[PDB]
Structure formats: structure tokens, C-alpha cells
Ligand binder design. Structure first.
Ligand SMILES: Nc1ncnc2c1ncn2[C@@H]1O[C@H](COP(=O)(O)OP(=O)(O)OP(=O)(O)O)[C@@H](O)[C@H]1O
Ligand SMILES: Nc1ncnc2c1ncn2[C@@H]1O[C@H](COP(=O)(O)OP(=O)(O)OP(=O)(O)O)[C@@H](O)[C@H]1O
Ligand SMILES: CNC1=NC(=O)[C@H]([C@H](C)c2c[nH]c3cccc(C)c23)O1
Ligand SMILES: CNC1=NC(=O)[C@H]([C@H](C)c2c[nH]c3cccc(C)c23)O1
Ligand SMILES: [Mg+2]
Ligand SMILES: [Mg+2]
Lengths: 326, 326
């Protein structure tokens, strides 16, 4: 159909998604794609807010699409496409920036975090708003770190509609609970990110499974020697249970009860072993999709045509409302 | 041909161009269009950096195109088109913003002038750079007030080419001399602009000719009672001679010599009378083009197709260089 419209995206900024991308975003997408009209985007225009190697940016664009498919995104149910192939994104982004307070974009966390900012680092939340609003998106499945961004997208949509009623769908932010943050393994306070310097706390989907298992087995826990889920008091330990729960389907309580009398060594064992079991089918699927790119680029080609059909209607509806000559 | 490529634009922010637009920009375009490949744009995407009435924005978009034709732009020689109908502008603008220093865009005069800025008020110089660079533009005919903007366009083009040699043409800024500033008549210090509050110092092309002549006859001169061209010491008086010279074809020296023994009353007489003679053929042409819009919208339609053919090649060349999957 075209109801319960969903939109979400990941940047092709690296050679692998990490567990946070896969559990905190892409896993939700796979549940949702059955009964939602879903658009899943590789957002390459966002990638170049930071300098990118061209051969790498292209290779990583395809690899990010491939990890979508290997994680279960289904091209028969959903639409996968590359942001830069749909001009409507930047068109709407220009418009939306005209309804976006400068201070409103200054107070955005990553701009506070730096401010050698560029205009692109400053305005990318506006382009993110156009990414979502261009597809009449009803819900946006993202992790917790994307919430402030999408309240800007909602506010600008409401500011625009106040002048032009009924023009843009105001999206609901759909954020998970536990998996909403997979934490670094060497620092279970901050999120597992591609920006914490060392890959040591970072579990990449496509890394060497024995290497990821080694990082898990080396994870920072605490001293209580009690396996119990409490993210404040037990950062490392709750993260690992969160990880093991997410890649297995077992609730955390059923896990914590099965861990009565067990130690933290047993906890890392099983989590590593389940992660390895999780990533190996992914890597096999990714390897074939990289070696046989017909499938993957047909998907992207069908996705881009479908995205353009939708997104360009939105842009002309906006343009008409603004008074542009069409 | 396709050599000596020219690009320039005016915002459809009002119901009339004023003498500054017509003498400081559009008159240069008409001289240039004979031996230059020229693209002349109605830049409506810039207009909405400030709230615009939709019925007015559309009507003024066409009226600005029409004043181009009534001032002598020739659709057989040049290309006239509406900015918003060519998606490449915002596409390139997103890219260029990633190569544009935040401080570099902060130091831009109009942002200093305000800073309730929006993102659009902050980033419009970047979109202006994409407007020009998207057409492999060799020269940009503009008045003196657009110089700081186009040094940003040149710098960003050079910053981009440093990473990707040979990708973007670096445009030369082509600025006139005398007409490079037509001044307000009630304040011959500052430029005649649509933003000085009172239309009283403002000569609109399409205003009532007797009203414009009245404003001229009421112009602030000085006390020397000597007709001589010196813009510092003689602000009002040099402006009027500048105006009369520009709308007649007579050099200022030939004028000043013919004004030996004459007073300032005679100076306003002739300038008003020559302006009236200038604007009446314009208004007749504009009136027909508004009443018979077939011609005008065929021009814009041919222009937009030609602009898209050029501008989209630039964008794909840029995208390829960046490493986007095409
Ligand atoms: N540690 C994490 N836990 C859960 N979700 C995450 C995590 N990191 C990112 N996400 C989610 O992944 C999606 C895309 O994130 P993004 O592409 O910015 O990756 P990232 O890990 O933040 O990389 P980068 O440091 O390059 O920004 C969003 O829905 C975001 O909420
Ligand atoms: N007073 C002026 N004298 C000479 N050229 C001018 C003058 N004002 C604008 N121009 C030229 O007209 C072109 C477009 O100007 P623009 O569309 O910004 O008009 P404007 O008069 O500045 O109106 P606004 O106040 O809405 O910006 C540019 O090439 C600019 O240099
Ligand atoms: C640097 N650019 C950027 N950093 C982010 O955190 C967002 C994000 C990747 C993003 C861009 N477009 C989107 C559309 C829907 C959902 C999301 C998460 C996004 O963009
Ligand atoms: C608010 N926007 C804006 N204020 C300006 O002064 C420029 C200008 C109208 C502009 C936009 N695009 C252009 C391309 C070529 C030449 C010029 C003069 C322009 O834009
Ligand atoms: Mg991020
Ligand atoms: Mg201006």
C-alpha cells in the first residue's frame, strides 16, 4: 500500500555498520517493513559534511545498502535508495532552511559540540528534515541520538504548515527502548559510535568475527559479580545483556534469571558467541552482494525511481504553495 | 555558441525593477548578450529567504522576466529562466556548503547586518555560488554590491577544485563603473534599494512616469550651483548625471560641459525627462507581455529546458568527483 509510511537512513561513512546501527535502527526497520510502507535511504549527501575519499564513498554507499539487505530489509516490501540520486532532497532542504531559525539550528548539539565548522555541518539537520518530510512520512524509526534532530524536522513542518495548512505530513518519532543505545564496550557510558577513536569498543558487523568476539570478551563490566540489568549502576553489564538479548530474541529478564549464580565471564562468552552467530550470516550475504552487484544496483535503481516519483510530488506541492511558477 | 558564458540574476521581490537593477545590471547584460553565451535567471528561491505572498511571488516572477525582455534581453540570443525550475541549483548548493567555512559565511555582510536570522538568510550566498558555478560560467555581470558574494563563489570553486582539479569553472566578476551604483535620490550616499523604507528615493521602472519624474525633480543636490561630476563631494548631483548619462548614451563629460552655466533645476528637468522617455517604452512592452503571457512563458519554458541540460551535467560531474553512486 502507501499507509504507515516510514523513512529512515544511515550514512555511508564507514566500511561497516556497527551493532548500534544494526540493533538500534535496522532491526526496527525489519520488524516495521511488513505492515509499513518503508523508505530506507543511504544518505550519502550527509556523508560529505566531512571529507570523504571518492572511491571509498562509492564503495561504502553500496556496502551500506548491502548491509540493509543482509540484516533483513526486503526489496519486495521496502524501498532502498541512495539520497543523492533524488534531487527533491536538496530542493526541499533549501525551502525548509527558510523556515528554520538560525538560533534554532545553532542550538543543535553537534554544532555546539564543534563551535572550523562548515555550512554543511551547520545545515545538515535541515537536510535531514527534508529527507523525512519529502516522503509524506508518518513515522521515523531512529535511535535515541536522532531525537533532537527530528524535533526540528517536526517543528519546521509545523511552522511551514501554519503558513500553508495541510502541505507537509508531521512525522512521529519512533524510538526503541533498550536497543535505543548500544554502548561502547570500553566505555559503557557513551554510545558505540564511529567517532570514539579506537575501534576497540566498536563491534562492526563486517569485522573479523573472532576479532569482535575478542572485543566482547574484553568488555568493561563492574565488580558486583551479579548479572542484573540496571543501566545506571551496571553500565557494561547491562549493555552486554542488551546486546545478547537483541541478537537472540530472548528478553533480558529471562536472561538475567538464567544467569543467577553465573559470573561475568559466562556473560561475555555467550554474548560473544551469539554475536558471532549473528554476524556470520550477514558477512556471507554481504560478500555475495559485493561480488555480484547486479542485484544490489537493480534494487537501488528501482528504489530511486520510486523515491523520485514520491519526493518530486511533495516538492511541487510545496513549490505551488510558495507561489513559484511551475 | 557556448563561449564567454555569462550568468546573472535578479530576485522577484517586488513589482518593479528600479533604476539600479536596470542600469547597474540589466543594461550590461544587453551589451554582453551579443557576443556572450548568456543565462539570465529570475532567482525565486532567493526571494523566499524573506516571507513572500504566493500570488505575488508568482506574478512578480513573470514580471521580472518581462522587464528583462522590455530592457532588451533577446530570447533568440540569451536564455531566461526561473531558478526554482532547475533542481541542480540546490543540489550544487548542498555540495558547495560542505566546502564553505561557517566563519566564511558569517563574515558575509548581510548576516553581520542582521545578526531572527534564518538558515536561508545565512546560506543564500552559497546558493548564489551554485547559481553561477552550475553553468560553467566564465563571467558574472553584477553591480558593486554583489562583489563580496562572488568572491565567496570564486573561493569555494577554488577550494573545490583543489580537491578535484578541473571540475568547476572559476568565474570572473564583471562589474561596471559609474552605473555600478545608482543611489537613492533622497539619500545619495546609500544605494537605491527596495529596502530603504520610502519609495520616495526609488525610481521604479514600472511606476507612474509622472511620479518618477516628480521624485527626480525633488532630488537632493548640493549648494555649489555647479554641475560637475564628483561622487564624493557632489553625491546627488553626480548621481543624476550618472542617471541621465546611462539612459541616453551621452558620456558624463559631454554632459557636464553642456551644463556649464546651467543650474541644478535644469539638471533635474532633463534627467526626469530622459527617464520618462526611457521607462515609457518599457511599460508598454511589459503591459503587453503581462496581458499576453504565451510568449513569456514559452521563453521561460525553453530557458528552463536549456538550463537543465547544462546545469545537470555540472552536477553529475561534481557528484562523480565526490564519489557518489550515480
Ligand atoms: N550507538 C548507537 N545505538 C543505537 N542506535 C544508533 C547508534 N549509533 C547510531 N545509531 C542509529 O543509527 C542510525 C544512523 O546513525 P549514523 O548513520 O549517524 O551512525 P553513527 O554510528 O552515528 O555514525 P557517525 O559517527 O558517522 O555519525 C540512526 O537511527 C541512529 O539513531
Ligand atoms: N542600487 C543599485 N545600483 C546598481 N546595481 C544594483 C543596485 N541594486 C541592485 N543592483 C544589482 O541588481 C542585481 C540584483 O539585485 P537584487 O535583485 O538584489 O536587487 P536589490 O535592489 O538589491 O533588491 P533587494 O533589496 O530586494 O535585495 C545585482 O547585479 C546587483 O548588483
Ligand atoms: C551528518 N548528517 C547526519 N547526521 C545524522 O545523525 C543524520 C542522519 C544520518 C540522517 C540523515 N537523514 C536522515 C533521515 C532519516 C533518519 C536519519 C537518522 C537521518 O544526518
Ligand atoms: C537574498 N538572495 C540574494 N541576495 C543577493 O544579493 C543575491 C543575488 C540576487 C543573486 C542570487 N543568485 C545570483 C546569481 C548571479 C548573480 C546574482 C546577483 C545572484 O541573492
Ligand atoms: Mg551520527
Ligand atoms: Mg540585494
Amino acid at each position: 500500500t502507501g499507509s504507515r509510511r516510514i523513512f529512515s537512513g544511515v550514512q555511508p561513512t564507514s566500511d561497516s555498520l556497527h551493532l548500534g546501527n544494526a540493533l538500534g535502527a535496522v532491526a526496527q526497520w525489519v520488524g516495521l517493513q511488513d505492515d509499513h510502507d518503508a523508505f530506507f535511504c543511504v544518505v550519502d549527501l550527509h556523508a560529505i559534511t566531512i571529507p570523504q575519499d571518492p572511491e571509498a564513498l562509492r564503495r561504502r554507499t553500496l556496502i551500506t545498502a548491502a548491509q540493509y539487505l543482509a540484516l533483513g530489509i526486503d526489496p519486495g516490501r521496502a524501498t532502498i535508495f541512495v539520497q543523492s540520486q533524488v534531487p527533491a532532497h536538496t530542493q526541499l532542504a533549501w525551502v525548509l532552511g527558510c523556515f528554520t531559525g538560525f538560533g534554532q539550528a545553532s542550538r543543535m548539539t553537534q554544532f555546539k559540540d564543534k563551535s572550523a565548522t562548515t555550512v554543511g555541518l551547520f545545515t545538515y539537520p535541515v537536510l535531514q528534515a527534508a529527507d523525512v518530510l519529502a516522503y509524506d512520512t508518518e513515522l521515523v524509526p531512529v535511535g535515541e541520538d536522532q531525537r533532537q534532530h527530528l524535533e526540528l524536522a517536526r517543528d519546521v513542518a509545523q511552522r511551514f504548515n501554519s503558513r500553508f495548512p495541510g502541505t507537509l505530513v508531521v512525522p512521529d518519532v519512533l524510538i526503541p527502548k533498550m536497543t535505543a543505545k548500544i554502548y561502547d564496550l570500553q566505555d559503557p557510558t557513551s554510545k558505540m559510535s564511529k567517532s570514539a577513536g579506537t575501534d576497540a569498543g566498536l563491534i562492526n558487523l563486517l569485522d573479523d568475527p573472532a576479532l569482535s568476539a575478542k572485543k566482547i570478551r574484553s568488555a568493561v563490566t563492574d565488580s558486583e559479580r551479579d548479572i542484573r540489568y540496571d543501566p545506571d549502576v551496571k553500565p557494561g553489564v547491562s549493555n552486554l545483556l542488551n546486546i545478547q538479548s537483541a541478537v537472540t530474541g530472548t528478553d533480558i529478564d529471562v536472561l538475567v534469571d538464567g544467569y543467577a549464580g553465573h559470573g561475568y565471564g559466562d556473560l561475555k562468552k555467550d554474548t560473544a558467541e551469539a554475536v558471532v552467530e549473528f554476524v556470520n550470516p550477514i558477512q556471507a550475504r554481504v560478500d555475495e552482494l559485493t561480488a555480484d552487484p547486479a542485484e544490489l544496483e537493480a534494487v537501488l535503481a528501482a528504489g530511486a525511481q520510486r523515491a523520485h516519483d514520491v519526493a518530486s510530488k511533495t516538492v511541487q506541492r510545496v513549490y505551488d504553495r510558495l507561489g513559484f511558477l511551475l
